Write a protein that binds this ligand. Structure first.
Ligand code: CU
Ligand code: CU
Lengths: 657, 657
C-alpha cells in the first residue's frame, strides 16, 4: 500500500512518494482530464516539527502538496495528500490564479511560434524568409502581467531571437516583436508590434565558444598549468541522509522545485550544549525588474523563483567543472505533467574548501617568534540554476567562527532587445554590440529566515552607529570622538520595515531577549551584515512594487504562521499585485507584535545592473554576498580548539634560541 | 664608488643603496651625532617615469629620501641623496614635527617604564608588588596628540598590561594608568592616573594556545583531514625582478617602510594593444579612532601607516602557514637607527589560487547539454602586518575579467582597557571578559589611486541609480519602472568630496574622457564598487577629523603633483591637525580643475567595530573589500580566450546522442 516513510520528516518526497501522491490525486479526480503542475513536500508545521524533534512529540504526517490543471477549467486546483493513507485530505479550486511555469509548460512555445502564420509574417517583415523559420528561436517567459488578460488565460510572452547557425549565441540578434502565447491551447493569440520596426541585424553573431574565439582573436590562450586540490584522507564533514555535521554545525539539507536549497534545523554544538540557531533559511522569491519604460518591456520583471522555480531550473552539476575537490552530491525529484517522477542528478553539491586564515597573532617583543596561525575551512552547499539567458550560482557557506554566508554569482547572458542603426540605447540601456540594446535592470532576492536564536522567543532590531549627541567641547564628549551603537528593537511589524542605511552602517540583530551573555550582558544574537541592498527603483504603485511588496524594504519582519513561505503569494504568474496576499497579508495593518515571539525575517538584497560591453556576449561572474554572524552568542571565539597550523609560545621561542 | 643601478627605476633601494645613502648622509653631517629614522626610495616624478618608460626619455636619477634626528636638536632633518654621485642634494630642518615611530624607537619603552619609580608606584597601588615588575608589559603607542606637549618633545604613551606567566595573552589584564614617555630621553615624564582607581584583575588570563585550551575546554579538536593544493607543472605567472606578468596584466611590485606594497605601472595587454590602467595604487594612510570620550582615551586614534609604517610592522610570512600553494616571496629592506640595512625576509607573498567560476552558460533547449564552463584563477599579492595588538592582512587580487580587488582581513587582539567589578562598559565599549572593556572604534583606510585609464588625461564621477523623474502613469513612464544611472562628473576638487550613498547604490567611475568605447559610446573606465564606507563618527573639528581630513569623505579627488603621497602629512605623530598640509593642502579652496587632467583619487573605506565576546581573546578574521572593475574599457568580456573547463556546442551534443 503506502510508501516507506523517509529517514527524516523534512526529507523531500522520494520518487515513490511522488508517484503515490499523483496516483492518489488521479484516483480522486477519476474521469477528469488533469495534468500536474507541482507535487512537493508539505513541510510539517513548525510547532509539530520542534515538538517531534526535541520534546518526544507526535510524528508529523507525511504530506504532499499538489497543484493541478483540468482541461477546460480556469486556473488550478491544489490540495494535500496524506501519503500513509493514500488519500486527498484537503482540496480547493482557485479559478483566478495561474501557477508556476514548468519546463514542459515552456518547452513547446518555440515550436508554437515557428508554426504560427502571423508570427511567420513578422519574421518575414523583419528580414527572415518564411522557409528559414528553423532559425528563429525564443525564450519563453511568463507574460508576467498584462492588464489586457489578467489571469483569465494562462499566458507566455516569447522573446524572439535569430541564429545564423545552431551553435550561435542568439542574443546578438533579437527581433522587434513579441508574440503572446496561450499556454494551454498552444496558440499565439496576439503579437505586440512596435510602431518603429527594426529589422534583423546583419552583423555577425557575437559568439564565445573556442572555435568562435579562434576565428575572432586568432587563437585561444594556452592551457594554464593546473592547480590540483586533493583530500587524500577524505573530508571532515559527515552526511547522514540529508543531515550534515561539520565543525559543530548540524542541519538538514532539503530541496524543492521552487526555492531550491532549503536549510533547516540548524544548530551549533557549543562544547556539548547543542544550541539552535535557525529553523529554516532559504531564498523565498526574486524579482528582476527591467528599467525601460517602453512597451512591452514593462512585462520584464520575472520573479524567477515563484514563476519558474529555482529547483525546476537547476543544473546537473558535474565533478571538476562546476564543483572541484571531493564532493558529495544530492539529487532532486519532481513530478512531470503526467504525474511521473523526474530526477535532476547532482542538483546540489557539498564540499569543503580552504578559506585562508581564520585567525593569527604574533608578539613583536621577540620579533614575532611568539606566533599562532590557524587556517580556516569553509563548507559549501550550492546549486546553479538557469533562467533562460541568465545563470544564478548559489553558495551557502558555513564558517568556523560560526558565521553563515550566502554568496551568489551571477553569470550567463544579458537579456537583449534590438537597437536600430541610429537608435540611442540610453538612458534605459547600453549598446553592448552593434544593434543590441541591453536594458537596465535590478536583481533582487528575498532571503527568508525563520530563526530560533538559542531557542524560541526571538526579536529583531536595527543597529545604527551614531556619534554621541553631546557636542565637541562638552564635558561628556570633550574631543568629539564618542560614538555608540543605537539599537531599535522592532515591537510591531511596522517598526521593522527598514532599509540599509550607509549613513549609519546599519546592520540588523536577530536575538533572544530571554537570555543574556554572561560577559557582555547582551542577548545572544546573529547579526545580518549586508550592504548589497538596493532601493527598489520602480515607483510606488508600479506593477513591480505591487507584485513584489517585500522588495520595497530591505527588512520585513512578520509573525510566524504556518505556510508563510512565498512573499508574492502562492501562485505568482499573472497576479496584478492587487489584493491582500503574501507579504502584504502578513504585514496587515502593521500593528501585530514581533517582540519576543515566533517571527519571520525577510531580507531584500541584490544588485542594480547597468550593462556594459564587458558583460557581453557572456558575462563574467558578478558577486553578491550577505552574512549572518554570531554576536554575543558565544562567550569567546568558538574556533580556538581548532589545531593551529603553526603555534610557538614565548617560553618555546626562548628555548629554541 | 656608486652603487649599481637597479633593474627598474621603481625598485626599492637595495641594501647596498641604503648603506651608500646613510654613509653619504653621515659624511654630510660629520661631527654631529645623528640617528636614522627613514631611508627609502624617492620615487621618480610621474612625468619623468612615464617619459622614461614610454617615450625613450631621460633615465630618472636614483634618489634616497632620508629622515634623521640629531641629539639635542628639536624635530628632524630630511632630504635627498643622489646615489650615482653619493651626495646630499636637498636638505632641511623641520624643528616642529615628529616622525614615524620605528621598531627601535618603540622597543625600549617597556624597560623604561619597568624601571621608573613613579610607574612602579602605580603598579604597586594597582596590586602588583614592586619586585614583580618583570610581569608588567606595555604596548608602546605614539602619544598620537596631546595638547599639553604638542610636537615639542617626542612622546609615547604606554598602554600597560600584566601577565601572570610569560606565555599569557596580556590583554585580559590591562591596568588603569597611562605613562607618558619621552622617546629620546628614555624617561617617563608624566602618568595619566584616573580619578577612579581600578586594581588589576584577579581573574585567570584569557588564553588561546593549545595548552591553554586543553585546560579550558578539555581537549583540542582532532586534526582535520588535509586539503592539499599542488601545482605540479608550476605557475602561470612570471616575475622578472619585481615585474609581474599574469593573465595579460603587467605591473611592478614595490614595497616601502610606510605603505607596504605599492603597485605601479599597471597595464593590460588587450590582444597586443597594451593599455595602461594605473600608474600607482597603495594604501596611503589609516586611522583607527576609538569611541570612548573619557580621558585619556581620546589619544587612541592611531594612524598606523603614517605613525608606525605598514612595511616596518610587516611579518616574515612562511610557507604553508601564512600563504599555502606555490609561492614567490619578496624581501623588504630598511635602515636601522645606525644607518645599517635591515631585512625582513618574505615580507610579500605572491601566488595564484582557484577562484571558482569565471563564467558559465547552458541552453535549456537540449537540457543543458549545450554548455560552457570556465573556471577562474586569481592572483594574490599580500603582506600581513602587526600593529601591537592587531594584525592586518592585505591581499591585492587580480582577476581574469580584468578587475582588481583589495581584500583585507582584520585579526589579532582587541585593544582593551580595565573595567571595575561594578562598572558598565556601554555605551562606549563591551565587557568581553570579566574586568575587560573593549572600546568601540572604527578602522578606516585611505586607498590612493593614481590612474591613467587607457593613458593620460582622466576624470572622475559619482554614479547614482535613479528612478525616472516622470511619474507613474505618464506617457514617459507609464508603469513606473523606468530607471537610469545619473553620472556627475567632478569638475573641481570640491565636487569630488562625496560619500557612499545606499539610497542610490553609488559607485565612482575613473575614466578617460578623450576616448570612446565603439560599442557603447561611453568612455573607458574603471569603476570603484565599494560599500564598506563608514561615515567618520568623530565630530567636525574633533582631533580625529583634523588629523585625518581625508577620512571625512569616501572620495577625495585632487590634482596630481609630485610627492602627494601621504594625506595626513609627511610627519604624522603629534600633529594637532591644524594647518594646510596633506589632503587639506591638496584640497585648497576646492576650486582647482580635476576634469581631464592628471588626478589623484583617495578613497576612504573600512569598518566600524562594536566588540563582542566572539572577538576575544583572539579575533576571528573580519573581511573588508573593494573592487575596481573595467566598464566600457573592453568591447567584450576579456576572458573568453581562456580555455574552458568544459564546452559542448549544440551540434556537438546532437552528435553525441
Ligand atoms: Cu543583470
Ligand atoms: Cu576593530
Amino acid at each position: 500500500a503506502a510508501p516507506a516513510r523517509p529517514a527524516h520528516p523534512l526529507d523531500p518526497l522520494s520518487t515513490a512518494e511522488i508517484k503515490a501522491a499523483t496516483n492518489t490525486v488521479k484516483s480522486y479526480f477519476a474521469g477528469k482530464k488533469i495534468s500536474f503542475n507541482t507535487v512537493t513536500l508539505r513541510e510539517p508545521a513548525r510547532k509539530a516539527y520542534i515538538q517531534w524533534k526535541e520534546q518526544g512529540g507526535p510524528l508529523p504526517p507525511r504530506l504532499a502538496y499538489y497543484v493541478i490543471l483540468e482541461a477546460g477549467k480556469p486556473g488550478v486546483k491544489e490540495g494535500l495528500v496524506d501519503l500513509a493513507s493514500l488519500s486527498v485530505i484537503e482540496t480547493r479550486a482557485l479559478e483566478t490564479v495561474q501557477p508556476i511555469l514548468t519546463v514542459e509548460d515552456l518547452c513547446s512555445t518555440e515550436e508554437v511560434i515557428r508554426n504560427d502564420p502571423a508570427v511567420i509574417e513578422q519574421c518575414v517583415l523583419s528580414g527572415i524568409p518564411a522557409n528559414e523559420m528553423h532559425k528563429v528561436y525564443c525564450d519563453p517567459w511568463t507574460i508576467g502581467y498584462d492588464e489586457r488578460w489578467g489571469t483569465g488565460k494562462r499566458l507566455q510572452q516569447a522573446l524572439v531571437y535569430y541564429r545564423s547557425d545552431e551553435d550561435d549565441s542568439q542574443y546578438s540578434h533579437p527581433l522587434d516583436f513579441c508574440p503572446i502565447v496561450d499556454t494551454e491551447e498552444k496558440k499565439v493569440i496576439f503579437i505586440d508590434i512596435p510602431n518603429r520596426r527594426r529589422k534583423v541585424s546583419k552583423h555577425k553573431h557575437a559568439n564565445f565558444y573556442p572555435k568562435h574565439m579562434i576565428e575572432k582573436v586568432g587563437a585561444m590562450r594556452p592551457e594554464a598549468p593546473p592547480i590540483n586540490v586533493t583530500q587524500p584522507e577524505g573530508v571532515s564533514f559527515k552526511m547522514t541522509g540529508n543531515v550534515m555535521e561539520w565543525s559543530n554545525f548540524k542541519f538538514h539539507i532539503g530541496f524543492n522545485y521552487r526555492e531550491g536549497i532549503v536549510l533547516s534545523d540548524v544548530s551549533y554544538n557549543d562544547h556539548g550544549n547543542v544550541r539552535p540557531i535557525f529553523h529554516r533559511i532559504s531564498l523565498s522569491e526574486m524579482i528582476v525588474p527591467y528599467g525601460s519604460p517602453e512597451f512591452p518591456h514593462q512585462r520584464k520583471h520575472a520573479l524567477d523563483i515563484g514563476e519558474y522555480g529555482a529547483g525546476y531550473m537547476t543544473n546537473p552539476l558535474s565533478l571538476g567543472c562546476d564543483c572541484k575537490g571531493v564532493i558529495h552530491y544530492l539529487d532532486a525529484h519532481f513530478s512531470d505533467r503526467a504525474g511521473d517522477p523526474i530526477t535532476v542528478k547532482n542538483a546540489v553539491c557539498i564540499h569543503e574548501e580552504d578559506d585562508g586564515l581564520l585567525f593569527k597573532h604574533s608578539d613583536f617583543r621577540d620579533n614575532f617568534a611568539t606566533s599562532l596561525v590557524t587556517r580556516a575551512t569553509k563548507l559549501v552547499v550550492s546549486q546553479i540554476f538557469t533562467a533562460a539567458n541568465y545563470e544564478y550560482c548559489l553558495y551557502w557557506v558555513f564558517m568556523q567562527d560560526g558565521a553563515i554566508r550566502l554568496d551568489i554569482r551571477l553569470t550567463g547572458i544579458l537579456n537583449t532587445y534590438i537597437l536600430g542603426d541610429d537608435e540611442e540605447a540610453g538612458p534605459w540601456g547600453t549598446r553592448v554590440y552593434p544593434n543590441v540594446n541591453a536594458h537596465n535592470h535590478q536583481h533582487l532576492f528575498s532571503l527568508r529566515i525563520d530563526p530560533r536564536i538559542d531557542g524560541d522567543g526571538n526579536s529583531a532590531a536595527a543597529c545604527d552607529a551614531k556619534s554621541s549627541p553631546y557636542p565637541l567641547g562638552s564635558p561628556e564628549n570633550m574631543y568629539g570622538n564618542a560614538f555608540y551603537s543605537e539599537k531599535t528593537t522592532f515591537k510591531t511589524v511596522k517598526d521593522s520595515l527598514t532599509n540599509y542605511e550607509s549613513a549609519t552602517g546599519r546592520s540588523w540583530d536577530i536575538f533572544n531577549p530571554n537570555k543574556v551573555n554572561p560577559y557582555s550582558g547582551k542577548p545572544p544574537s546573529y547579526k545580518l551584515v549586508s550592504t548589497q541592498c538596493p532601493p527598489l527603483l520602480a515607483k510606488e504603485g508600479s506593477l513591480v512594487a505591487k507584485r513584489a511588496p517585500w522588495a520595497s524594504h530591505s527588512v520585513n519582519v512578520v509573525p510566524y504562521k504556518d505556510n508563510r513561505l512565498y512573499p508574492s503569494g502562492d501562485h505568482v504568474p499573472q497576479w496584478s499585485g492587487d489584493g491582500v496576499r503574501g507579504m502584504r497579508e502578513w504585514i496587515g495593518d502593521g500593528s501585530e507584535n514581533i517582540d519576543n515571539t515566533d517571527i519571520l525575517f525577510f531580507h531584500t538584497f541584490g544588485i542594480t545592473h547597468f550593462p556594459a560591453p564587458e558583460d557581453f556576449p557572456l558575462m563574467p561572474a558578478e558577486p553578491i554576498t550577505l552574512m549572518l554572524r554570531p554576536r554575543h552568542f558565544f562567550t569567546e571565539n568558538p574556533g580556538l580548539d581548532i589545531q593551529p597550523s603553526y603555534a610557538m609560545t614565548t617560553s618555546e621561542a626562548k628555548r629554541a634560541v
